[PDB]
């Protein structure tokens, strides 16, 4: 919890540890033992509820609509389990990534901009974490309220059904007795924990991306005065200064590239699994939306599911796209200085940088796609087209 | 002088800017708040009543869609009002920079630049006049048709006319209108809102097109300067003079790129909302036409709603395409000079110039995509595919 | 005739003029007045037949299948009329294009290579024309053939229909000897002239593209001895010789670029209109193919329509794709030479040529799209997808 | 069997010859005669069996389900026939490709890296060959077992049908007598031979791609020390050494480019035909999967067909994608050296190499597409969408 890129992200690491995202790496060994059991317990509880959910879906397969709703719930709550199991297996690469920026470069002339942009990155990371936490809390409260404003009823004739936030089969009578209140408490805990683990892993990915983008911003900001330093014939000392500045710029850019590659390594398969689950979720959600008539509870539930799913996709796409834009705009930043007035070394450096910048940095979901607003647009178009085809038929 | 003269007039007629005819327009908060107050007028007079009628009084899907199309267009125009009010500062700074560039160019001693200047001024004036006049005519006719009907009926049949006047649009208000005073005041506010919306549409579309025209003129001036550098290369002038001339050319290129950047920054969200709404409206109207195909009165309304949408899309697509095309052609212009006659250093500078000039530079729609004519082609292809698939799947 | 690019394409020009494609530019003035009259008559005749077909469409609109057949025939025969009218209005740009290569560059060292490749180009052009001519003739014959092997009958009860090669309404009897013979002769003339005019304009476009591609091939081939001439410190005479070689290379490349630009300006709107017609043609043809059930005549007619349409599109796309491939291969071949042994001027020339060649030459349908095998693939995929949807429904 | 790129692929060549892939080139001429007859015999048997399958299709066309299954089998077994015929007609380009790496370049400083990466390439080829052979054997065993676990019955009433591994019509009674065992043995041999020939040709293609990728890896690994060799001004000996190293690097890169072009020429049409057959196979398989209900034999057969087809496509796509990725990453490797400290020739070499690497090497299916994971994703999405539409209808 000391070296760079772990001190900056320490609040997010603490959230993830608190919810149960393992990570037995960033505290004193004294807490190493107890926390572990807590994690296991949480996992077990999750699985328990998940299993008790799946069992319900087995006897809810007589009809199609209830089957569709149960399947959507199961996929939505499969996301967090997949993420929670995914992290520990790849903890090696995750810890390699979190220790990438422990020993960065330094130059006297660019220390001030470096510090300014580091602080800006930290502030942006904290803001993102708080915003996502607020969204998660709002979603939990909305679920816990909608489960009460509506009416619990089963259509066959009318048959009362236990009023619970998540449909589930329980060995006990979870209708009116203390089993009812126990079930509500357990389901509330399940909702909070699942949403927390999923969104916290997503936020860690996005925070890595934000740090990379801010480092690119600093690189451009110092690109502006680097040429002025070169422009000025020149004495040996000035030539050495230009060489050192160019070395600093190139090495910092290479460091940013290393960080981006490590982030991709760490999270590509997670992105692929997320999108695979999403696809089916969105298909079922389009079928469900085909049945909406009015502004009743059903519409609220369908819109909530669609909004949460597309919001996760949209966060990923936003930050991938921002990385792409900064990496590309490096060239514009390099062109707008007085490169024609510099020395031969500076002009060649600008040339090579401009050649390099033609390809934008990006994160690929296991080489099957890249995260960007184009991906979000394609997903949205596909779901809209499928919904139109459904409604026409 | 005063680039975008007719655009300044039309903006002033909207109270968007109170001192448009100044060489360096100023952004004053008085205009901001006055324009916000004006923006709230069409919302209350047109948007809300029409939306209420759509939600409540509609009885069938056909009526729903027919009432939904015009309401969507009005909502888009109001959104344009709000977006441009928000981007006031950037838009005004862009206009000021364009004026500065034009003033710098107008001091030229070369007849080619003067001809370019005159052609650009004539083009902008003519385009603004035609577009604004046509849209004002359309909106005034649509709004005031029943007023003219009443006047004609009163003049011809005197007091025996069996004609009762109604408001220009199908809408429902919160209060009654049977009273003459309320009816008259609501009618006046409806006309005020329609006038504001028409001026908004015309003025902002004309501003986008005219800024594109001026950027194109600047690119042509850059082409002329590049050709002059080529002639100086052929004539064989010393290295330092060629360095200076290339430096000036690069500075002009940077200025034009800055202008494109400002235009994109000012109009990205405008274009995104425009394209989204237009495409969705095209799909909806195609569906409606399919449901009411054949010879009948209903087909007429959809046939009228379409062309406005297609032409409005085509305008933006064409001018964004021009921006991209000129920005690209800079590379050809710089390749065609006798650079092989220059010593390697100037050739390397030209190489960096060419590397920069080749990057696709244009106007994006909220960064989702770069707007060009292929965007219109894609929208048309999707519309046709949707139409055919709808016909087949119908039965 | 005695100038380049019109001497090479002279057979195409003569064929075009022979079939009535206006172009009163490339013969002695004595033939100017007779030829013109002929052209007018041909157009007249064409239009007349076209009109006589459209009238039939009016009385064959109550049914839906014959409406589709008539519409397909009408669009097929619309192509030639549009091309015929299109050429004269834009004749100025066509003549500007045909006069591009009247005064080309020349260098002693690269003359032989030039000549060879020039010769090569002509050969290919000839082949193309012949091939297309053959195809055209085949189509005509096949058409006529089918019209006599099938049975001319209309379903209402069975009503004998006049046995003509194109469904048309005629004031004549069109069944007895005189009317039947006249209709057969007139329709044969119509088919020949329409196919010939359309394909002749298409072949002119493709021949322009072939010439451009062969010029690019010449540049790539000669780029090697240019560098070897640079490589060897050099004496002044060698510097001047290398400069002359570089100047020749660059000027010839710019000339090729100008030719490609002129070709695009000449033919963009023609391509746009062609594909606009072809889209509706292929939609109706997919619906027609939905009804095939093994019958020889109907299946053969549908397959012929589809083959001809896709063949026109394929010809345009393949030649555009060849242009793109040659343009990029220019960079590829600029790389693969002994530049590392050269001088500063030669290496800078290589760098600038490669940078320029980063963007490939192409022909666009008035900037609404690009002609390449990708466009043909898109058209084919769209038609196949629509057909599959139609058959499933 | 002595020169490079054939000593490396020798197990592949021997397996191809043994299965009957003609290729009478890489053994003593004394064996050329016998082997030849063997090849012909295999083909005959294949076609013979193949024919008897097609015959069975003709009399099974009463129903649509059996027709669909027969067509799927017919295409699946069309694949190997097409590959077997395809190789001999294009054998000249194959032999040209296999002899492409007979005389590569050599530099004293980069010999160890070249040897290491050559050995790594050989090991990877061997691993790929063994894995593909294992998959083929597993598929054969699965077919031979599933034919026995299931019940041989035909539906009208219940009609017993011969228990054979492939539906086929035989002049004799292949139900109970020695005909049954003869048919079993013949069909086992047929399956083994067909799968072996197809997969062996594909594995040769993939081995070419792996060799190219490993050569690119060697190029990057040696690019790292090349700049440091240049950086240090330089005495004439040093400049000669840097020139020699740059010459080596550029020539080796050009050699890899030549190899990639040769592979593309050899196998583009094969890729096009493979994907053409796949498309229809996958369409029919989606229709078949629409009828699955349970975990019975039918589901197993359908899932196996889909798995095999998508596995072939996935193999092609993964290796094409690897080629693209290595070719692109050459640019990153060129940027990441210490060029800012190098000399002018080294810096110009870096600039030109980056320019070249701006575009990535790839293999195209006759210019109609590129083999990459994007193609696999598009195929998978198309089949999934078609299945969804089918179930909706």
Residue numbers in the entry:
A (entry chain A), C (entry chain C), D (entry chain B): 4 to 159, 168 to 243, 313 to 473
B (entry chain D): 3 to 397
Give passages from the manuscript:
Most insects, including human-targeting mosquitoes, detect odors through odorant-activated ion channel complexes consisting of a divergent odorant-binding subunit (OR) and a conserved co-receptor subunit (Orco). As a basis for understanding how odorants activate these heteromeric receptors, we report here cryo-EM structures of two different heteromeric odorant receptor complexes containing ORs from disease-vector mosquitos Aedes aegypti or Anopheles gambiae. We determined the structure of a heteromeric complex formed by ORs from these species in complex with a Apocrypta bakeri fig wasp Orco that is amenable to structural determination. We find that these complexes form asymmetric tetramers containing 1 OR and 3 Orco subunits, where activation of the sole OR subunit upon ligand binding suffices to open the ion conduction pathway.
To determine if the 1:3 subunit stoichiometry can be observed with other members of the OR family, we turned to studying the OR28 receptor of An. gambiae, a main vector of malaria, that responds to the natural odorants acetophenone (a plant volatile) and 2,4,5-trimethylthiazole (henceforth TMT; an animal odor, originally isolated from anal secretions of mammals). The cryo-EM dataset of the unbound structure also contains an active state, suggesting that, like the AaOR10/Orco complex, the AgOR28/Orco complex exists in an equilibrium between states in the absence of odorant. Overall, subunit stoichiometry, mechanism of pore opening and ligand binding of the AgOR28/Orco complex largely resembles the observations of the AaOR10/Orco complex, suggesting that these might be conserved features of this family of proteins.
